[PDB]
Amino acid sequence: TTAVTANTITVNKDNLKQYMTTSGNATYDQSTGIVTLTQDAYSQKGAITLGTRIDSNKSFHFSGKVNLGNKYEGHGNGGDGIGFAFSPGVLGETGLNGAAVGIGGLSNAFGFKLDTYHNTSKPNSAAKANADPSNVAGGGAFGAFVTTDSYGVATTYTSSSTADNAAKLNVQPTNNTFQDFDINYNGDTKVMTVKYAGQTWTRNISDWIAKSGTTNFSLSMTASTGGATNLQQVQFGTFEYTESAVTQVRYVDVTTGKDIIPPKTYSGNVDQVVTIDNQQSALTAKGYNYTSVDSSYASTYNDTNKTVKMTNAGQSVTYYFTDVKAPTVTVGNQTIEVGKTMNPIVLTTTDNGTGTVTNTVTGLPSGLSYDSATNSIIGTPTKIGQSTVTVVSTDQANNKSTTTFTINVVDTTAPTVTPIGDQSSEVYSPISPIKIATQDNSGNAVTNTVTGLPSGLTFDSTNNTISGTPTNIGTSTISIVSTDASGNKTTTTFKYEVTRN
Ligand SMILES: OC[C@H]1O[C@@](CO)(O[C@H]2O[C@H](CO)[C@@H](O)[C@H](O)[C@H]2O)[C@@H](O)[C@@H]1O
Ligand SMILES: [Ca+2]
Ligand SMILES: [Ca+2]
Ligand SMILES: [Ca+2]
């Protein structure tokens, strides 16, 4: 087996903390997926960043909701807004507070902002942002693409097309409600489509990607307040992307080719050297011994130091282990009744491994068999006695155990006897012989003894009949005791009346 070197991941509210990191004033509510980036208070800054580089040769997609606040330019003291930034620089870094709207401060980056505070006059040098454009001045929050230069200075993107020009929001933030927000990037066309509360911005971003000097990016979502404020929040929702600059590490059963424990993904910046873990002690605890390392999908791997060096493309290292623990069968001793269909004895087996376990069974009583399909001893035992049953349990790695238990086939069921009706016949007349018919679960001989016979009548053990000529008028109770080989007994009776002619 071989896995992909770069996964296509979806970040959701439950795995968010596995893939992303909050910083500054940001907090997170896992039950709702709500990242609160700032509260409605002065001088706040909060961010969330994705801990793996995104490959822009593949599609990526944020689908969620955003609360931009409840006041904005010309309608309350609202700011600063929320920035969604894609940076060619290192993971974990965020843009600046203020007019930079979380994008200014990052070099050669691009992104999209929702901007509630119109910075009409030129921000100072330290703000790393040009003024907001005239075409969105005069009232209302607006949305826009943003790009930065090599000094980290943000320019709000404007154009002569309504497709991607900076534009006032159709749905203004008046009441702290969450609106639908979507950033969709198509890795085939390089077109980024941003949608906020039904309003769309669309642009081919091939040029900004080329200007950034790379095809793999660090994603941040950052909001701030200064003297102007707002509750600013992003709700997950989901973020889908394909990894760049990762190494996959798998822990694989050499016999089956299956993952023994979950694989691990290490992330870094391009050229970052990262130590990976072969998890030997965890595999040992699971009954596995180290076998080898295959690093053919990670040419940067150094087995002495256990390091890889991240590249744009994903790498993969596989550690192989061998299952060195035999399976266990637990089966207690059994007592079953001869000539009855037994309820199955399930040969309950457990094993530490990833493959198939095969049981082979010997020493079964006659009539019993091992059913593979149900892993059970089934059948009807035909013979009294005790057997030692041996079960040899073999896993796919050829670890073997053998277990024995006893099956005692017993007879505790008494014979059954066809009923004989009460009889009547004339004194001194020979009778039609009365047949005594028995059956038993042992399938073996039932022996009968008979008492209480009218005088002149005889029981014959050879063919189990009563016959003869009765010589006394009167009434008899004939008593038959039927015994199997095990000593189980049945008493059957009937009345015999000897009459006058
Ligand atoms: O309140 C506006 C007033 O405050 C100043 C600081 O003196 O700027 C702060 O407020 C702005 C809006 O929240 C931010 O853009 C800025 O980063 C923050 O320092 C004044 O510059 C501004 O006029
Ligand atoms: Ca602004
Ligand atoms: Ca095993
Ligand atoms: Ca019996």
Residue numbers in the entry: 251 to 751
The authors write:
S. aureus encodes a 2,271-residue SRRP termed serine-rich adhesin for binding to platelets (SraP), that is involved in the pathogenesis of infective endocarditis. S. aureus SraP, a surface-exposed serine-rich repeat glycoprotein (SRRP), is required for the pathogenesis of human infective endocarditis via its ligand-binding region (BR) adhering to human platelets. We determine the 2.05 Å crystal structure of SraPBR, revealing a rod-like tandem organization of four discrete modules: a legume lectin-like module, a module with a β-grasp fold, and two tandem cadherin-like modules that create the rigid stem of SraPBR. Further structural and biochemical analyses reveal that the legume lectin-like module specifically binds to N-acetylneuraminic acid (Neu5Ac), which may mediate adhesion to host sialylated receptors.
Here we report the 2.05 Å crystal structure of the BR of SraP, revealing an extended rod-like architecture of four discrete modules. The second module adopts a β-grasp fold similar to Ig-binding proteins, whereas the last two tandem repetitive modules resemble eukaryotic cadherins but differ in calcium coordination pattern. A molecule of sucrose binds to the protruding loops at the distal end of the N-terminal module. The sucrose molecule has a “bent-back” conformation with the glucose and fructose moieties perpendicular to each other. The sugar ring makes hydrophobic interactions with Tyr367 and the morpholine ring of MES, whereas the hydroxyl groups are stabilized by hydrogen bonds with Ala478-Nα, Asp330-Oδ1, and three water molecules (Wat3–5), which are further fixed by residues Asp330, Asn347 and Ala349. At the apex of the L-lectin module, the Ca2+ (named Ca-1) was embedded in a 7-coordinate geometry. Ca-2 is fixed by Asp573 and Asp601 (bidentate coordination from Oδ1 and Oδ2), Asn602 (Oδ1), Asp645 (Oδ2), and the main-chain oxygen atom of Lys575, whereas Ca-3 is coordinated to Asp661 and Asp690 (bidentate coordination from Oδ1 and Oδ2), Asn691 (Oδ1), Asp734 (Oδ2), and the main-chain oxygen atom of Thr663. The rod-like, four-module structure of SraPBR has three junctions with a buried interface of 700, 400 and 220 Å2, respectively. The second and third interfaces are relatively small; however, they are more stable due to the contribution from coordinate bonds of Ca-2 to Asn602 and Ca-3 to Asn691. Moreover, merging these three structures via sequential alignment of the same module resulted in a total twist of 5.4° along the axis of SraPBR structure, suggesting that the slight interdomain twists of the three junctions are randomly occurred and could be canceled out. Together, the results indicated that in the presence of calcium, SraPBR adopts a relatively rigid rod-like structure under all conditions tested.
